[PDB]
Design a protein around this ligand. Sequence first.
Ligand SMILES: [Zn+2]
Ligand SMILES: [Zn+2]
Lengths: 179, 45, 318, 99
Amino acid sequence: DMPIVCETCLGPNPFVRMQRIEFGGTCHISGRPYTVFRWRPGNDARYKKTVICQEVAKAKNVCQVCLLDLEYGLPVQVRDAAMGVKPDEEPQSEVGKEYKLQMEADASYAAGRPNEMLQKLQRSQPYYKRNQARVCSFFAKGQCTRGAECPYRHELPTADPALANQSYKDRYYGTNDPV
Amino acid sequence: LVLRGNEAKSLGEVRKLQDAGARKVMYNLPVEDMHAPVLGPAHPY
Amino acid sequence: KEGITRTSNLSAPIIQLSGHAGEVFSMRFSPDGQCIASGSFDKTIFLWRTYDENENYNVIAGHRNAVLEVHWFTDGEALLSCSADKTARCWDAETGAPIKKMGEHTAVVNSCCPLRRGAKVFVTGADDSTVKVWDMRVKKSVHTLRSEFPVCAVAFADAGDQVYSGGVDNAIKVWDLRRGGGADVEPSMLLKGHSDSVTGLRVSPDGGHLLSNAMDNTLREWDVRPYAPPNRCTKVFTGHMHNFEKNLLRCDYAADGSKVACGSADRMVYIWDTSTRKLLYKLPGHSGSVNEVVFHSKEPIVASASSDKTIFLGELTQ
Amino acid sequence: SKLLQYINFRMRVTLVDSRQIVGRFMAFDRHMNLVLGDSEEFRRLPPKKGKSEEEREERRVLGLVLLRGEEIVSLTIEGPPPNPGGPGIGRAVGRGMPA
Ligand SMILES: [Zn+2]
Ligand SMILES: [Zn+2]
């Protein structure tokens, strides 16, 4: 009825026009058809859409968009490390994952003292710069004709080359998440 | 006749509260009944 | 179970009235308390029974824009509807026919109040800064006064010779209509103390007190007794809200003068005890700004109308 | 004519010989013909001193009568004529609360 979203991934505007595409995608983790939500966080933003199921979202207390934790905004590793909790038991397989889901249908993150570790390692103001156009792939190759008009960032990619290959399932579960 | 009276009365049953979870209100009560918060240590969340 | 002292004859102590298709801007109880006139943004008037089914037995149409304000006429069979389509309309309630449609105003006819003792006469104040008095049987308007700022709320006094108009100009005015048979009369009384616009005006059941709701998020109570202190301001109420919606949020007195109900923009039905000037009921349940609240003529029943296309209809327990 | 306002309205008639006809109005002709339902003839007998003019005018009951205008002189009124449910619902609902 409403996305489960990082309040950074709603941008500065207290008013949000968001598109609701029911059955608009497959959860990037449970592979399930779910209701997608799409919106422009702010005027400098792009159009971000939810990436995972609503359940698969509220299991690990992560945003449906950035897959970062909901309380502190750090990847699911960094929060699981400071939470000290076991490795993910949840089945990687989708037969397994859907079986776990159809079970939990028919029948730990809210009650922790605020961990100083996570608090120490988090951003004070919101990373709105995460809600912004990708980089113009034609500006990189030098072949962009769209000029300043391009809705895509006219800068070059300045990124760790082991990064920029991140996996949804791994940023949601917490295994070899390079960030 | 003034012999002795207490303030024990007007409390008890009359103050009709709702369950700390219920998201409906079935009857129009005063603000101190229907509202007037639950209780207890903020909790951790 | 729970057996809490059923006040009214209504089937339940909280009844939601649905069937509208727009904001509900103003409502009114029949003088004999067994009818509801609900005027919606959908330029339509639903007529509900107050008992035994709550049946909307008639939908009267005929305005081309939102019916902003409705009262009943003193006998309860004729209805006065005021709208945004610049047209105030007299209807027969039992029948479903319109009686007299006067459209003399140039802009949205925000506010109206029909006189409760005397002839069939009602005031209407609209966006043209003119508050006009309208007698039933003549087809011309009987009076026309000109302020400079668009008229938001108007009421006709208990006794029937003065008119109260309040608007965006930070001061509510009382005018005398028999003192004025001319076209640029100057105002008789200047009730000041609201810090911005007035939205709703109700005449007290004795006629000595006037209730003003203001987007000063303040309810103010003034006395209209011609022998008053220098400051006619008596009472102040805090608690309700006005927001960017700037809807026509109104006032009401309980039929006994014991409570005062305001519509608010925080979706809450507010009911203060006039005496202690404090909040008796703060009823939730509305999804849109609460436009007008009406106290049932006989029982302590309160019915509210919201900008959420419904009307809650219930009784007060304490 | 305005005696269209006058059909079904009970009326009294004077004849030239001054005989009185009281009945109710049914139909009227251009020739001042009339149709009297429930008609009775009140004929004025001479007033014999010591009695009221009002208490002994000879009443005959004629029944349904029709009146030729040629001897119709005057007509007056005698008395009066003788003798969406809309798309609304109301349902019981609690008021929702935010906490
Ligand atoms: Zn997010
Ligand atoms: Zn480009």
